[PDB]
């Protein structure tokens, strides 16, 4: 996250870190047994780490659970990143408490202008590399689809939305992939892609979760 702030330990209780010997993507806990992340974060051998703040220090509130199965969206296209969503089932159910909580799925899609909270352990420099050990947060509004489409011609589908600042300076970045975009208490997006990080007129692009609620509900109930 570039231009964001330190969230504070366990202030984003639904935030997950996907680890395969190191942190490589974020995710969101939707109930005690399932996590939603981005399909481009797919890897075999994932351990889900819950209740994390510093990912390099065991501070006491962590729960490390391996994944039993991963399900990438049936129509995920790795070339366009269209339908960039995946579900991860935990081998054991997590113990929900104040530090580990699930986030609600939306009943409707959010409107442009809505302010959201984006979080992650990704790069914090637009030009450079600085990976933080604690969770960073960023408040950003959903942008109109027109400004999103003018920035990325012929690349935005109805399953994507842009959030951010066209002036640049504030954005999600690599290492934040798969993490949550929560607006009005609901998970509305998944960190998916963008052009560099925090560049002028290049906002971040997010998977539009409101379009996948039936697939998510149907899939977790049958697995
Ligand atoms: Ca830790
Ligand atoms: Mg993240």
From Swiss-Prot:
Is inhibited by scorpion cyclotide trypsin inhibitor TopI1. The keyword S-adenosyl-L-methionine does not apply. Substrate binds at residues 171-172, 174-175, 177. It catalyses: Preferential cleavage: Arg-|-Xaa, Lys-|-Xaa. Its EC number is 3.4.21.4. Binds 1 Ca(2+) ion per subunit. Pfam families: Trypsin. GO terms for molecular function: endopeptidase activity; metal ion binding; serine-type endopeptidase activity; serpin family protein binding. Synthesized in the acinar cells of the pancreas. It is found in: Secreted, Extracellular space. Residues 1-221 form the Peptidase S1 domain. GO terms for biological process: digestion; proteolysis. SUPFAM superfamilies: Trypsin-like serine proteases. Its cofactor is Ca(2+). Keywords: Calcium, Digestion, Disulfide bond, Hydrolase, Metal-binding, Protease, Secreted, Serine protease, Signal, Zymogen. It comes from the Eukaryota. GO terms for cellular component: extracellular space; serine protease inhibitor complex. PROSITE patterns: TRYPSIN_DOM (PS50240), TRYPSIN_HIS (PS00134), TRYPSIN_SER (PS00135). Disulfide bonds join 7-137, 25-41, 109-210, 116-183, 148-162, 173-197. The active site is at 40 (charge relay system), 84 (charge relay system), 177 (charge relay system). Belongs to the peptidase S1 family. Interacts with SERPINA1. This is Serine protease 1. It comes from Bos taurus (Bovine). The gene is PRSS1.
